[PDB]
Amino acid sequence: DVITVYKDCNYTGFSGGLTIGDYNLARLNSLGVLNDDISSLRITQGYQAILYQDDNFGGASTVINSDNSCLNTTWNDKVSSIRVIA
Amino acid sequence: DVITVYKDCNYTGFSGGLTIGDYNLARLNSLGVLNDDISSLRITQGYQAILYQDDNFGGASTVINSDNSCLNTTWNDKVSSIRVIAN
Ligand SMILES: [Ca+2]
Ligand SMILES: [Ca+2]
Ligand SMILES: [Ca+2]
Ligand SMILES: [Ca+2]
Ligand SMILES: [Ca+2]
């Protein structure tokens, strides 16, 4: 995996590993990752995660290109879909 | 390279790529990385960097197990040797 999303801040709690591709809520759930639940994530250099407020890559978005130990109030427990790219 | 050390904060400036192993100042210099100069580091999941205040792994140490965009006052521009190990 090149991206790992964690339930709690500081890279702890249930985690899901992601590789290049698109992850709507259903796909995140298949990994055990819940909606409006991610709080931190690791980004392997050379990759990035585009976070989306709504499912199916809709709503406001933000790009994470380095490990984030605790998402801010706008993004913490708000992610519903993610796109991972090189 | 599972670990990249940068000259400046926010992963910018001259960078050196490190893999599993031990890096005294001599080895860091062979990569162009200077003494008391590192300010940020990217660390690939599954690996970690043990920083040392002095050369040859001497003095105080600290572990960087996730990207650090700007070392604190105690470690910024103070690293003299590093060891990369599995995490
Ligand atoms: Ca959470
Ligand atoms: Ca990383
Ligand atoms: Ca949401
Ligand atoms: Ca510096
Ligand atoms: Ca030093």
Automatic annotation (TrEMBL), chain A:
Ca(2+) 2 binds at residues 36, 53, 78, 80. Ca(2+) 3 binds at residues 43, 67. Ca(2+) 1 binds at residues 7, 37, 39, 77. Disulfide bonds join 9-70. Residues 47-86 form the Beta/gamma crystallin 'Greek key' domain. Belongs to the beta/gamma-crystallin family. This is Predicted carbohydrate binding protein. It comes from Flavobacterium johnsoniae (strain ATCC 17061 / DSM 2064 / JCM 8514 / BCRC 14874 / CCUG 350202 / NBRC 14942 / NCIMB 11054 / UW101). The chain holds residues 501 to 586 of 957 of the full protein.
